[PDB]
Design an enzyme around this catalytic site. Structure first.
Site: not given
Lengths: 140, 140, 140, 140, 140, 140
Positions: E51, E11, E117, E128, E114
């Protein structure tokens, strides 16, 4: 002012053994930021102009095949006088004269298959990053 | 005989980033004991006599405001020839000449906002600890 | 909202051996900030109300003398739900049921001379910090 | 070619405090292999020929009793020019001139009870390992 | 047989603070190999299908802007049952139930922003990596 | 009372990769003392009674040859309830159920070539150390 960008690379020995975490750490905890981190094997198209000045050496073929053996990690860092700081913190290419605390002075044993390559000067750094990193690859 | 006491301080950059753990470690694992560890911002009443010899400098106001920006950690260590050992293990205030393995040579980038201040001599150490630590604050 | 403050202490065993660096690290690298760090031996004036609820125990005298043996480090941390996070990350006071990765589960062997004390609840934390840290001692 | 073998030892201070893990690490992560690791107290039968050249010294008796106090760890490493690399990476026996990053420069305080002993030359190394390690003890 | 490939991401908080070294370490020292490591900000063209199942959430816009704030690091690892091992070694997205020793359980404080991932299943991982890593980007 | 002695071993994978430093650390920094540290390959004379109860298994021959491949490190530790503490801090032999923070849960990937062997019970520990360590080998 403070946008000087350098280049650090990982030899196939570094990854085949696996040390990239601490290598990144020694710059990350220092404060230098990274703008580019690309992973590849680079083939032989880029391992001819990178060492173009070393083409007239007996070890050129063997060493370039050694580098070509496996994939290599490429990083770009930026910071105040980063180019000079990187080379001294990396340590001399010859382990015989390599004080403790430097990356090459703490994981390299023989001159032949060294671990880390870094730009000696700003011009070398910019030329190399132009050869390797496309302008869109980097960030700010 | 071996009761010589020194002083080490943490700049606001060190805490705003957060590095006090390793800073304490580099002395704790060495063997030096600590007699005093106080946390404060020190206001401006103590950041005038600490740098009283540096009052006649153009950077005095800016640097003293930089130190006054946030809280600062104060430590006192004792050991055989501890004062000399601390300064060399800390590293030169100028990162340009700062060999790897020293705290200032491993986390500091620019001379302006340096990280660690330490006593150069025993007299400076005792004067500073008298200015900062009350005799009851310390332990044995 | 996020100003909840807890308390962590270091037993005389922790300092006589010397582990405060990693103890601070486990909270510093997490993200929690510290508002107060004071060093003392605390005499016996504060080691009676701290364990006032444990006064009716056979081990009260021996354990309180064990704590009184040497100086003790006091810390205060703040963070979202910090009180619960500290206790679980510290580990159960009984090493027999102490999963790896917790401070008490990685350096403590016997229930008798445990290493770390922490507030179970917010009320206990505020009462203890009132007993130990004066309001001017803390920072923001 | 690359089978040169050296010897490194741990003083009783090193084990009574407990540091053997990082001592082993500083060679293991470097790349040097170990052929022999034996634990003993060595009595006084081997702590007379080890320092036979130092028998004519006032500190011989006190220092040899200090070493004889507790058990001592013995290690043997092999690598390219390992003997020279070990001594420099260990650091000068005098902590006063011991740059950071060396084992003796990061955990030793006084010349008297030093921490690490190592072979200065290949002949000393082979003589010592013959005195200590039987040929069947080592491995390949 | 053992060619299962997963995906781990960093992130913007992880890089703006700077923790990628230990994040890489926790997999590198484990034994898992990496086939792809690319650095980018990913714009918004890829933070809609990543997402897509979470598009019907009140926090989708705020969280996607939070991720879009800065550049993000992307990694791909391979190993025996690597997908399951990564998620458990990472720790629960909620720090409230996150045992010590996991990356998210050692550096994350709040559910909102957070740090890491990771793919829950093999199908998610392959989808992905197809979305992010071109087939020529990876290595063997 | 507190003289219970256990046994920990290093598989050939652990040394051929090289991890003994942290393996020793996880017990040394805990507080447990070591009484015996011997290095050998053990031939096949001792790798028949060590797994005598496992002789009636299809994997006995392959696994015993895998262990016999290279030299193996042997350690003996002592501490309060050390045998139980070692096994839990080591982690389950199956990496699939191995929480982070345990040695086997942080460096082992597959059940086949596991890394660490340890005594399940006091009787097993004493029998094994009798098989391996002669009474004069140990120390106090």
């Amino acid at each position: 002012a403070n946008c000087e960008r350098t280049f650090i690379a990982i030899k196939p020995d570094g990854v085949q053994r696996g040390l990239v975490g601490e290598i990144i750490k020694r710059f990350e905890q220092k404060g230098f930021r990274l703008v580019g981190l690309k992973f590849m094997q680079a083939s032989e198209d880029l391992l001819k102009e990178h060492y173009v000045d070393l083409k007239d050496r007996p070890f050129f073929a063997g060493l370039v095949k050694y580098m070509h053996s496996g994939p290599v990690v490429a990083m770009v860092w930026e910071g105040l006088n980063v180019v000079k700081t990187g080379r001294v913190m990396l340590g001399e290419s010859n382990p015989a004269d390599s004080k403790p605390g430097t990356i090459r002075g703490d994981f390299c044993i023989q001159v032949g298959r060294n671990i880390i390559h870094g730009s000696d000067s700003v011009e070398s750094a910019e030329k190399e990053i132009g050869l390797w990193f496309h302008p869109e690859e980097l960030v700010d």
